[PDB]
Design a protein around this motif. Sequence first.
Motif, short mmCIF file in Angstrom:
data_model
loop_
_atom_site.label_atom_id
_atom_site.label_comp_id
_atom_site.label_asym_id
_atom_site.label_seq_id
_atom_site.Cartn_x
_atom_site.Cartn_y
_atom_site.Cartn_z
N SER A 1 0.82 -1.20 0.00
CA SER A 1 0.00 0.00 0.00
C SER A 1 0.86 1.26 0.00
CB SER A 1 -0.94 0.00 1.21
OG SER A 1 -0.21 0.00 2.42
N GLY A 2 2.10 1.13 -0.47
CA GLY A 2 3.02 2.25 -0.46
C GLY A 2 2.65 3.38 -1.40
N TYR A 3 2.56 3.09 -2.69
CA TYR A 3 2.30 4.08 -3.74
C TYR A 3 2.18 3.40 -5.08
CZ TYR A 3 3.82 8.11 -0.87
OH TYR A 3 3.95 9.07 0.11
N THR A 4 1.90 4.17 -6.11
CA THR A 4 2.26 3.71 -7.43
C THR A 4 3.56 4.37 -7.85
OG1 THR A 4 -0.04 3.36 -8.05
CG2 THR A 4 1.58 3.56 -9.82
N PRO A 5 4.56 3.61 -8.29
CA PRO A 5 5.82 4.24 -8.72
C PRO A 5 5.61 5.31 -9.77
CG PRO A 5 6.10 1.88 -8.51
CD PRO A 5 4.63 2.14 -8.32
N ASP A 6 4.64 5.10 -10.66
CA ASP A 6 4.23 6.16 -11.57
C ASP A 6 3.93 7.44 -10.79
OD1 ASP A 6 4.50 4.24 -13.47
OD2 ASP A 6 2.35 3.92 -13.77
#
Lengths: 39, 68
Positions: A1-6
């Motif tokens: 649930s960190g992020y989207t690298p985009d």
Amino acid sequence: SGYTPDEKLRLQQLRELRRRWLKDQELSPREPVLPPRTY
Amino acid sequence: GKRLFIIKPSGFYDKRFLKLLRFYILLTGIPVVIGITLINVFIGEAELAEIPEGYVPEHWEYFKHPIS
């Protein structure tokens, strides 16, 4: 649930834009305001 | 930072219109104010007395003030 690298890259280079835009936004070269031409 | 760049809607049109408006309202304000002052000063307002006997008073001069 960190992020989207985009979204990491997007957020990052958007930060770049805020950087440059605000560098612009601070204005004090040449003191730009130059309005004309006891008792 | 040192000095930020402020963003204002505009200064030119408001201040301009005000300068103009004042200019004209004063432009015929001053002669008139001066007039009321003068005829207030050199010419007297008026004084009453009363209707003379067998005398026809004119149309005007039933009224105090000279501009009247």
